[PDB]
Enzyme design. Structure first.
Site, PDB file in Angstrom:
ATOM      1  N   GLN A  39       0.828  -1.192   0.000  1.00 53.69           N
ATOM      2  CA  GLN A  39       0.000   0.000   0.000  1.00 53.69           C
ATOM      3  C   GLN A  39       0.865   1.246   0.000  1.00 53.69           C
ATOM      4  OE1 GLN A  39      -2.299  -1.115  -1.338  1.00 53.69           O
ATOM      5  NE2 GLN A  39      -4.081  -0.353  -0.196  1.00 53.69           N
ATOM      6  N   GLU A  56       6.371   3.791   8.287  1.00 56.11           N
ATOM      7  CA  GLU A  56       7.790   3.594   8.540  1.00 56.11           C
ATOM      8  C   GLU A  56       8.286   2.193   8.154  1.00 56.11           C
ATOM      9  OE1 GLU A  56       9.304   6.566  10.254  1.00 56.11           O
ATOM     10  OE2 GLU A  56      11.045   5.761   9.177  1.00 56.11           O
TER      11      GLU A  56
END
Ligand SMILES: [Co+2]
Ligand SMILES: [Co+2]
Ligand SMILES: [Co+2]
Ligand SMILES: [Co+2]
Ligand SMILES: [Mg+2]
Lengths: 189, 186
Positions: A39, A56
């Site tokens: 994604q 992250e």
């Protein structure tokens, strides 16, 4: 039980939590080397390029995977919004202990938000937010015991009913005797 | 949604989780300065001294507090028992995602324990341990979506019902179309 010098105690080399994070990070990276990023990453404009705002692990796995380009969404966000987003995405993780949950809400409040907006941004009742914040008035060792899972949120609420200077004593009683929440409530006297 | 050079995207300087851990460590250290340790450290003999077996934060906070000595309990643990303890204490935390819980169980199984033995040690039903382990056959991106809270354990179980080659597709549908567990199962 004995008294040992701190200088004669080395750290615990067993860090399964860290080991698991590295393993899964690598497993995520190996998979994206093939099909690329899952994604979209969330970024904001910065100088010549961009600055990561959300995703992250996705970001670091892409690096490990050796990818040259990744799909992203650029959004103009002020430092304040970026922080708010960081706190909010963190509060959504299945990772949240109730103590971290409370620290997150408190940080959002310090940024100017209301329990209402906070609750909205996280999808919970205002009462849920207020109740979590109350945990922050407990002594550090009580919050640690909660994070270690040695006591429950219920035990913590019972300790909040005791006067401040009796909370440590109460914590000990609960731990030493394996008290239930109900009996922790009886501690008041 | 657009594609862009990964090299043009720098790291996120906002790490609230790490910041909170550091802040709470300090407040714990400040508290130990006044009260000492609430619970002894668990250690085992190692080299010329001792090695911490449980209570890492309490330990580091004590160091930060400047204490010279701390209460402790010494036990003779083999490397295996120490690891087992480490995994079990981690599994008791209010800190775990259901994926970490599964990884912990698997680690215990690999050490020679039985699902039954794992269940007995963590205070859970054998079925709970077996169900948790099933999550590990899901592809990495599905587990990340779970850990990020983008999908629930229910969604994860639904994806397990799809054939391996269709799981990524299924993940996209749940995220993209935003369907619920109910809708997911199909
Ligand atoms: Co403590
Ligand atoms: Co409770
Ligand atoms: Co920060
Ligand atoms: Co939880
Ligand atoms: Mg705007």
């Amino acid at each position: 039980v004995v008294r040992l010098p701190l200088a004669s105690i080395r750290p615990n080399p067993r860090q399964p939590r860290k080991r698991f994070a590295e393993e899964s990070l690598k497993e995520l990276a190996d998979s994206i080397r093939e099909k690329g990023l899952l994604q979209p990453l969330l970024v904001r404009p910065q100088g010549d390029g961009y600055e990561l705002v959300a995703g992250e692990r996705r970001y670091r796995a892409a690096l490990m995977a050796g990818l040259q380009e990744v799909p992203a969404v650029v959004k103009d966000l002020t430092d304040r919004e970026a922080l708010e987003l960081a706190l909010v995405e963190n509060l959504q993780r299945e990772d949240l202990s109730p103590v971290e949950e409370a620290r997150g809400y408190q940080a959002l409040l310090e940024m100017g938000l209301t329990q209402e907006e906070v609750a909205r941004r996280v999808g919970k009742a205002r009462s849920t937010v207020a109740n979590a914040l109350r945990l922050l008035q407990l002594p550090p060792e009580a919050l640690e015991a909660l994070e270690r899972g040695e006591i429950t949120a219920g035990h913590a609420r019972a300790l909040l009913m005791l006067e401040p200077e009796d909370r440590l004593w109460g914590l000990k009683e609960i731990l030493e005797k394996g008290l239930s929440v109900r009996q922790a409530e009886a501690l008041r006297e």
